Amino acid sequence: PEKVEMYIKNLQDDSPPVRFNAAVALGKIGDERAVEPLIKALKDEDWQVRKTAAYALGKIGDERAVEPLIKALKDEDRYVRSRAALALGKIGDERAVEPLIKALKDEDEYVRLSAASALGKIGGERVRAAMEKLAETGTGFARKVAVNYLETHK
Amino acid sequence: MREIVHIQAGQCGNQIGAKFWEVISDEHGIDPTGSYHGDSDLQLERINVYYNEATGNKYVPRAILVDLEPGTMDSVRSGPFGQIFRPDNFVFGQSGAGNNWAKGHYTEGAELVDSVLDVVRKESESCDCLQGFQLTHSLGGGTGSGMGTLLISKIREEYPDRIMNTFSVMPSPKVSDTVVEPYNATLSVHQLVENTDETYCIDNEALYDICFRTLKLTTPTYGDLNHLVSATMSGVTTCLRFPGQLNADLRKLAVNMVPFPRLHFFMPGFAPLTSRGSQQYRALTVPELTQQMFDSKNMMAACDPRHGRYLTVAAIFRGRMSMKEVDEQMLNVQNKNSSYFVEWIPNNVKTAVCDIPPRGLKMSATFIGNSTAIQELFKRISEQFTAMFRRKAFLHWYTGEGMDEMEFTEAESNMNDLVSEYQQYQDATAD
Amino acid sequence: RECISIHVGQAGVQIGNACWELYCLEHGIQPDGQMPSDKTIGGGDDSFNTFFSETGAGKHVPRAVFVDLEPTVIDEVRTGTYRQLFHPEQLITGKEDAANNYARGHYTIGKEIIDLVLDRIRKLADQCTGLQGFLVFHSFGGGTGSGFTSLLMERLSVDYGKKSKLEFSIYPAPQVSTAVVEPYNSILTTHTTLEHSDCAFMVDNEAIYDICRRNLDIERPTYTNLNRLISQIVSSITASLRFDGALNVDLTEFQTNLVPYPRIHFPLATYAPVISAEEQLSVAEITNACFEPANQMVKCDPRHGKYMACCLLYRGDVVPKDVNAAIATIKTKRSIQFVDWCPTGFKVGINYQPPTVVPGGDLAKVQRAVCMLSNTTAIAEAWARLDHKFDLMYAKRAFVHWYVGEGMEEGEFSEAREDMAALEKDYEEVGV
Ligand SMILES: Nc1nc2c(ncn2[C@@H]2O[C@H](COP(=O)(O)OP(=O)(O)OP(=O)(O)O)[C@@H](O)[C@H]2O)c(=O)[nH]1
Ligand SMILES: Nc1nc2c(ncn2[C@@H]2O[C@H](COP(=O)(O)OP(=O)(O)O)[C@@H](O)[C@H]2O)c(=O)[nH]1
Ligand SMILES: [Mg+2]
């Protein structure tokens, strides 16, 4: 409580390792006050701050993070994309099902895997419908994930 | 590489062998009934090297006591630690070699040898991973010499993958007035050059000189000489008995010490040299100990180290002392004496520090040297042999006991070859 | 995606448990393998699973194997504080050691245990989705460190072809020197492993002994003192492979960046700051110290050679602008000679995770640290020292009979030395 105000002002700070350490801290404690400042750190100049803000937003869970994380699946950095996909899987919001399906055709193995894992964690009915459609009208890795989900779910 | 099997042959072998047990049993915290009554955890860490854990908390020496003279059997058992030895491990004859090598190597000794091999086979079986063998004997008599070297050859042929190490006591006219001793010594040296991996040269001439010239022992007994031997055997085997890196096992020590298979005869040394029961006085420092390591007066073999070059050196410091002090003193002794160390063997001087000091001393140093100056020892025996053998004097005592004259010629050839070999490496340069 | 660590002989095994002590501390893993919510590192994303498999319990087990031809050293691992961390099948021991003889570790005694070790590695390889390769720890001077490593390296090339093999080698010193024949064992291992290793990081026992006395003020440094330091440097080298970092991520990135000629694969590592716990250093200071011969893992003069590669791995409180500024001064101010055909490019990596020190260790906790990896011609000085020592003893054929009696041919000594001569010529010729 008394320390949450501190790390929120360290997230703003000039020094990149200090900004990184502020985002690591706010994920370790996880207060509802840290949501909007960590949402701003998703658009940070440094990839090591962006990826740990994304991991923090997934741990805390707040719904306000669902939209900036959806845009974060399109981040230039492979680690930021994997951490954003996994965060959306932790939150489990059905608004993330289609952007996560688009991440199944990413150039990075970890990102593809992270998107597959996230979809499995959400596993509603809209996920199932999208998996059914992808199992029939889908290709390669993205098809394997649809087919594997429907076989892990009798 | 864990267990070591000990064999002690003849009069000298059993005397010096029993003093070794008396001393290391006290060091390891063992009483004459085989019960551990010590305090340090380190005393029992590598106890399985020289002892068997027969029954409960009880420890037994892995020792085989041999002699063709049955008198030795009672001497051992009536002694201080006589009750710890296995009763079945005493193999004694009813005859004697009468200081004849042929009697111990071919006649009376060869009759009893198979009974001894039965006992060595027994002890080799209750061994998890046998390192090797250790023989304590005299080269000047008939039993320790003839039967002892028959045993060495018989063990070498049975256990060839195992290390064969000896504590051989060299005859001297100063100590024994027996005439045929050069024959017994030359015939044994010939066996040792071929069938041992490491031989500690304990010269009775050096032992007498230390007692007479330095300890001021007016007319020393064997008890006075054996005090030097037991202290040396205690210090040279320290690495093998306590937890340590450098020369921990017989093979690891053999690798570091032996560059050439025939040049395996070591000049042992000790510091400080205290007379039997002469009240402990003046605490030595690391520099005083290091100086007494190189000092010819402190050598257990009658050779000047300054009359040769060192091929390899193993130094063992015992007690509570600075590692910085030992490292400093062993570095100076090499640089300020570079001429006495072989240039072509990089880092040939190996130092070791054991925190457990010996009985009665707060600090001690043991020296094991493979110096080319040990040819002086063999030259002395060859000169002694030649004077007699030229005339073929008393050869009938040996040839009558199923030996040949060519055996005498082969022994003489081998010992002269060994001396020439020591000379070649003494004269050898790195260039 | 995964790396297997092999720890051979006394040096390798002892270094391995010092490494693993630090890895656990770095990733927030307890000595039992548990990683609870209070001790979990915090900042999400973690790639430590390249080195630790995960059990159904939540227990993190090292993807490590420990081999020794005698039980003494691994018994200490089995009874130590980390007895719980490793599974019993990972720790392999014989009875009779190699007695500081290469031929015993490679032929006689090594041939007895090689097959079991391989099946134990196979158990680990079978738990890997995409095994990148191996990290091999061993000494040059021990019979097992030299002999068994080369025998295993030979067998891993056949059993695992397209798999990287990066070594961490204990280069001998006269200070911590348990054998006369260490130069023989060193030349023999380097000859037989050369065609099987992809990269080799040497640790010169004389350099670490010198660093402990100079930087940590230890009067007569013991194996405990040296090992805490080795593991600090080693962790900084392997950090790339265990963390979500951009430079030297997989074993291939390490080979690609650091090694341009195949035989010449011995990078010299430097590390700053090495402070005794008894004053804060900047990015400029720690970068500058990397180019100081006093701070090197191996004793050599880089001003006398040419570079083929130069990587700077920073960790902790390290700001991008400060790193750029520090590098810029080093380009303009220093006399760093690179070979013509390779570009004068300093590959930089920054991890903002604070440095983790050994509690009860001789090392102080610093804000920032740096580990430089340089592929220099100067490392031929380390080879020359060894080769001369070898030549002294070999000319008189001293100790050779111990090798020929343990399943080895004397010609393998001449063959070995010939390969070293070629390696020395290669470093000389490449640096014109
Ligand atoms: N830095 C470091 N060096 C060590 C350590 N243990 C041994 N050494 C060095 O390694 C060399 C000896 O080789 P070892 O690793 O002990 O031998 P080994 O692989 O167990 O082989 P064998 O002795 O034949 O059983 C010498 O240079 C020692 O100083 C250690 O824990 N750390
Ligand atoms: N130092 C020492 N030498 C001894 C001892 N007993 C005999 N010797 C020497 O050993 C040689 C004789 O060997 P000995 O053991 O009596 O004959 P064996 O019974 O036939 O082996 C002579 O050179 C003696 O000086 C002893 O207890 N100590
Ligand atoms: Mg070992």
Author numbering:
A (entry chain I): 13 to 166
B (entry chain F): 1 to 44, 47 to 360, 369 to 441
C (entry chain E): 2 to 279, 284 to 437
Quote the paper:
Microtubules are hollow tubes made of parallel protofilaments formed by the head-to-tail assembly of αβ-tubulin heterodimers (tubulin). As a result, microtubules are polar structures, with a (−) end where α-tubulin subunits are exposed, and a faster growing (+) end, terminated by β-tubulin subunits. We present here the selection and characterization of αReps that target the tubulin α subunit. αReps are artificial proteins based on a consensus sequence of a HEAT-like repeated motif initially observed in thermophilic microorganisms (Guellouz et al., 2013, Urvoas et al., 2010). In this work, we have selected α-tubulin-specific αReps. These binders prevent tubulin self-association by targeting a surface that is involved in longitudinal interactions in tubulin assemblies, with different implications for the two microtubule ends.
The structure of tubulin-iiH5 was similarly determined to 3.2 Å resolution. There are three, virtually identical, complexes in the asymmetric unit (pairwise root-mean-square deviations (RMSD) ranging from 0.39 to 0.50 Å; approximately 1010 Cαs compared). In the crystal, tubulin-iiH5 formed a helical structure with six complexes per turn and a pitch of 54 Å (i.e., the width of one tubulin). Indeed, iiH5 makes a 1:1 assembly with tubulin. It binds to the (acidic) longitudinal surface of the α subunit. It interacts in particular with the T7 and the S8-H10 loops and with the S9 strand. iiH5 also interacts with the N-terminal H1-S2 loop. In addition, the iiH5 binding surface is basic and is mostly formed by residues at randomized positions. The titration of tubulin by iE5 led to a dissociation constant (KD) of 270 ± 75 nM, whereas the same experiment with iiH5 led to a KD of 95 ± 15 nM. The different binding modes also result in an overall surface area buried upon complex formation of about 1650 Å2 in the case of tubulin-iiH5 vs about 2470 Å2 in the case of tubulin-iE5. We calculated angles between the α and β subunits ranging from 10.7° to 12° for the three molecules of the asymmetric unit in the complex with iiH5.
